[model samples]
Target: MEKEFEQIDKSGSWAAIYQDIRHEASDFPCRVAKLPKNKNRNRYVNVSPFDHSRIKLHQEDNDYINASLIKMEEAQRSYILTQGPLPNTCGHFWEMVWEQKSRGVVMLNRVMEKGSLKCAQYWPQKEEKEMIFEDTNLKLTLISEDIKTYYTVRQLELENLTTQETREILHFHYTTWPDFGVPESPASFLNFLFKVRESGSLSPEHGPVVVHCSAGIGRSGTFCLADTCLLLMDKRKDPSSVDIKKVLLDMRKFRMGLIQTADQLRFSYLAVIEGAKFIMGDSSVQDQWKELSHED
Candidate 1:
């Protein structure tokens, strides 16, 4: 497993491998028939939710939001990959979360990156404590917070203003990833990934966990790929049994352009390799990774 992991880096031809695989799998269907007709609601021209798996806002005239329900049945993992909420769509964003009963939101981008607003400040502020979205008839209140070096966890309360009912939602925000690249190291990335998994929100019993970055395909895709691949490896009990490229192509069928770059693809493999080490019975490896991630 270690040799297989290093071979990807040693080969120094990931670009070729990545491009070739995409080209070979270019014919894979991107089922986009029921995408919303309004161009303004979509964040990217190439990214769209497939008709079969798109998330719809409840009780709205226009039920469209720039989000897709990515269901990985093989790994028994489901996620809603969405773009960061636009100012106009913030209310609808909460509406989807409310209707879906999502247990948590896994955010992979900061509010802004490189002088541009990547995501709206959709959650509550420290001083504000709570925010009401009149458009969606929902209120978001910050219940508690745990700050880490590279990430932060917030306990959020989502209330249906109309019904006067509420539910708890975990918000896991990874703050340090750059705009157009992978994380500085896979250890930190794996640590963050495990943190989300530990929340139990990614499990199937709840609504699909909402995952997003700026465009929802780059960093967002990377996160889902790593999580799904690691789970597959653990379930199969064989690192060699999982086909990373095949799993990625399968995920793209629901939402386009997952694992956006060759670098991200390489990073995914590295993280999976490290995670496989822990999954294959080295209990102390996670502790070493925790120290390496400096999450203590």
Candidate 2:
């Protein structure tokens, strides 16, 4: 376990290759589809590519075509809390900490107020697991302090790019660890995600999960992309054999968009491959791979 965790540091090459594997697996029969977007809604409300490139033509602000499309759009937009321009409707506003362009790192966005940068921190310490949300009269308020200062990802004004450390905050908003157990196996992680979905914990009103580590972009990207792929593969009952590139291209639309480095991609696949190997038989897997080559 120590060895595997250590490998996460050299994640560049592995992540890139894993992404390719996901793409290829999604090639045929499986139907790798990109997420859909809305036409009448404000452009900024949609994800990056959706707004900048694929603007949907619409006649009115609230003109929803079908109840089903309205439901789906509501569901999809929940995950994008924070980090972008605030949409006109509260239905589109998720809590985010953003740094101001002219104010340097000193300026940050506060969820309570618009265009006000008050919650950003320059240096944050690693914190133990803690609750990040509090219930309100009609909504769940994201307690700004629940997030670690520097360790957590925060959105910044375009000007902050001047600093070497300035990074767009990236995160995963799934469920937290269970009280009686730790996420030690792939099964455990899967179950945790299932519970999150089942509980409706990420309701649009409550803001989606925000996940971050060292580099907000890279590891966070891998986690988010892999998470979506996991759901897709689970639906098909063939996660290990699923196309890698298809999964990555879907994610790339959002962040950088997805795995660009080789190591990062490789790590993504190996996580699935090695995790499956461990579950099937770690000792046997170790013995078998010890002598194999490309052809084997």
Candidate 3:
């Protein structure tokens, strides 16, 4: 497994692999997302979740959200990958989260990036402040926030107004991950993934973890692939058994485009390679990596 990583890195087969496996055109029916009523809910026309995997809002009469549940049963990983909520779709976003019973949200991009709006300011920033979605009868209250140089962890209270039931939620925001690019290093990206894991949100005991970047296809997919590959590597006696490319294609089967670019694909391998050492009981690497990644 180690030598294969070196072989791919040196030969730059990442781009070749990326080019060979094209994004599957939406051959399955995306009938709901294309409807006039739900068209405004989509942030992008081309990026629509498949009806089979698309999450349907239980509370709404017209249930449609640009969110898909990506389940990798072999890896024991499940995630709901959706676009950053649009103004009109923010209500549905929270509704999906609550209905899906997700405990944490991993956001990979800023609300605004490169002088343009990448995502809507969906969650409340101020503690104790409430963001209400009247249509969905859902309200999100910011409970607390812990800020870091490159990322932020927010504690939130989600209330279903009608039911008066509430749940605690964690918001994991990677503020430094750039658009169409990987993090500073495999070290930092793995660090962030572990942080999310620490909260037990990624565990199957709860619900699917909610992960989003602006369009949700690019950075969001990268995070899932890296995390899933590492887990597969950790569990196997023979690390060679874990095929990164096959795992990625399996995930993309659930979501439209799991890893958007070759660069991102290359980074996922780098992250898994670095993580494999730690999984094999080499603890020193992460301590050194902490200093290596200033972004963390």
Candidate 4:
């Protein structure tokens, strides 16, 4: 959190960081994220997982899903960043979750956005309602749902129909984020983030949390970047010492096009700085951030 920009730097410094990220993307020689032509969807062309970090589905002939495993070793943070599931790939999405032993899924996009179907409604909506994936032989049932101001927390019971084994999965969906843009402010975003943290889904004791947006690079990248940076700050006990650009570059090694827009990158810095205030022992900042975030 740089103190020079109290009002926030919407200027050259941010641009420089953005350019650095671009340079890193260009300099990286390996472009091994090759997906099969038949399995491709026209809606999301550029979204693909890097070969080295891609998650392979067990017992499936084609294991390529537009998802990557992003691991921040120092922070001990792992996230499965993925594109919103396509209609045909819904079965594969659940299979990935089931095989990975994930405790939670953090979805940053809606079923539809601005008249376009950005993602499929892959989960169940009612208590007794269940979504069955015949291709994968898995079932997902909605146990409960808690709606918040900017998000929803769903308790889902996932069972393998083949084995009759069930596991509880938490779905933390942030519904307020606009497509192709950042949030209104850092306060509300941080509030949602802290809620996810409180749930203990991101703890190392469980599997990596699944994070996704439309393309899985813009908002999804922002969420993971901010979370990792904040954790680094907490681990090192020095917010100013964290190198955000370097972290983003490292993250892009796992998945390309992370932090899609300059505005998203800028928002990440703002959220990191604001979050650092609370972690740095500033008690009043929490109340102020909550009020500002909640106010329309």
Candidate 5:
């Protein structure tokens, strides 16, 4: 059980961290993004997956990522980002968004570069053609900014395509947006979420959903798992009767055992319970989910 719940990278050597935790699953969509993995740089490692094969390892620093994967993935063709800044995590992040904008389906993220791909070379002509393709496919854009000016110096070209009525945008972010690495001030991050939700830029046609940090397996996983708990609570009217132990045990059987820590898992229920209490103008309903939110 401890082996099942362990964080493989915290105490292991780089080689161990580099090795993928082989899993034999018939149902889950497991992905390993290649990003940078070095001696001391802890920028992404602290928040990323410990599986090496699942990651798109990068080595250097650069701006811009190859947008080809977005197009090919949307087209349902399998390919890899084997180029400059080789495993561009954020760039691949945009690729996911672009795919969502282009197709209304949620495809699996096969792998991504979790680090910088420095040794990657660039092909100007090929990249230009790819850029042209991306420019013509969807209606979304990205803004690159400089901290000096505090404004966007460059605007990402929008991919022009036929507009649809309902589009689902599954947005992913690492940790709490504003309070990343901090545990006490999630409220400060609320504004960032509010702005995006209120941003007229995204239409229902491009229904942008929210996710938290990394491959969305930690905090993001907690968010989804929590929602599932609430929904189950609603389904079972007797909230106190909620059997969290039996429930999470079942979740582990189907999921990557102990998807979220008890503490992390509790955040979701507490948020929901707090919200419900406010909405109903009552604090009467106890947080029964906590009792069953064990770190199994």
Candidate 6:
């Protein structure tokens, strides 16, 4: 695994591999997301959820949302990969999370960046205050925060207004990942990933994690790919036999345009290899990673 990552930068096949993964997805129709009524719900015209795997809303007549439930077989990891909600679709976003019974949300981008609205501000800005999704009869109340150099952790209470039953959701916000680019180092990104894992939000007892960036597939895919590859590696006899390329291809089957840039794809391999070392013995590097991450 490490050998392939060592040679990835030198090999011109990086672009070739990126293109292949982009175009090699099975031709699935995205007919629903293109309908006239559903067009406004999509944040980007080019990005749409496929019909077969799109998550359906149970509220009223609006069943469409720009989201896909991705199930990875090898690692038994499931994630609801979705776009950052549009202003009009914010209610639907809360509904999906409530209906899916998801306990965690992984937000990869900020609400505003570079003079653009990358994602809508869906959560409550203050503790004890609440953001209500009327259509879904749901409310998001920020309970607490753990702000760090590169990331922040928020504990929010999601209440079903109708039932008055509430659930606590872990919202992980990664702030340091560069726009249209990769993180500064494998350790830094893995540091964020490890923190999320420690929260037990991705445990089997919980619902599939809801992961989103702006368009959802790029950074979200890289995050899922790195975590999934590490899990599969622990199960394999030869860690190198854990096919990163094949695992990525399999992920694309559920969500289109995963790992948008070759740089992100390359970073996935690097993070996986670095994380695998920690899983093996003779690795004081894991502690090194923790310290390096705070260098910011």
The model with the greatest lDDT is 6
**What ranges in model 4 sit over 4 Å off?**
3-13, 26-38, 41-43
| Window of ten residues with lowest summed lDDT in model 5 | 145-154
lDDT of predicted model 3: 0.86
Ranking by lDDT: 6, 3, 4, 1, 2, 5
Clashing pairs in 1: none
Instruction: Kindly report which residue stretches of model 3 are placed more than 4 angstroms away from their true locations once superposed.
Output: 23-27
Top candidate (TM-score): 6
- Measure candidate 5: CA RMSD: 13.2
- Candidate 4: the clashing residue pairs are none
- Per-candidate TM vs. native? 0.92, 0.35, 0.95, 0.92, 0.38, 0.96
Shift of residue 58 alpha carbon in model 2, Å: 17
Model 1 poorest 10 in a row by lDDT = 26-35
Summed backbone clashes in each candidate are: 0, 42, 0, 0, 35, 0
Q: Per-residue alpha-carbon lDDT of model 1 for 189-209, expressed as tens digits?
A: 988988898888987789999
In model 3, where is the ten-residue run with the lowest total lDDT?
Answer: 19-28
Per-residue lDDT over 1-296 for candidate 3, one digit per residue giving the tens place of the 0 to 100 score: 46876787788687777876664323577888899988888888889898889999995478888999999988888999999999888998999989899999999999989998989999998975699999988999899988878899999999999999999999999999998888988878877888898899998888999999998889998999888887887778456788887887888787787778889988887888788888778879777666676643
Local lDDT at 21 for model 4:
80
> What lDDT tens digits, residue by residue, belong to model 6 across residues 1-296?
66776676677678877888777766588999999999889999998888988999985797999999989987898999999988988889988998998989999888876788988899887985789888788888999988888889999999999999999999999987865788879988888888888899899899898999999999999999999998887777358768898899888888888888998998898898889887665368767888999844
Off by over 4 Å in 2: 1-78, 81-216, 274-296
In angstroms, the error of model 6 at 96 is 0.9
Off by over 4 Å in 6: 282-284
Ranking by TM-score: 6, 3, 1, 4, 5, 2
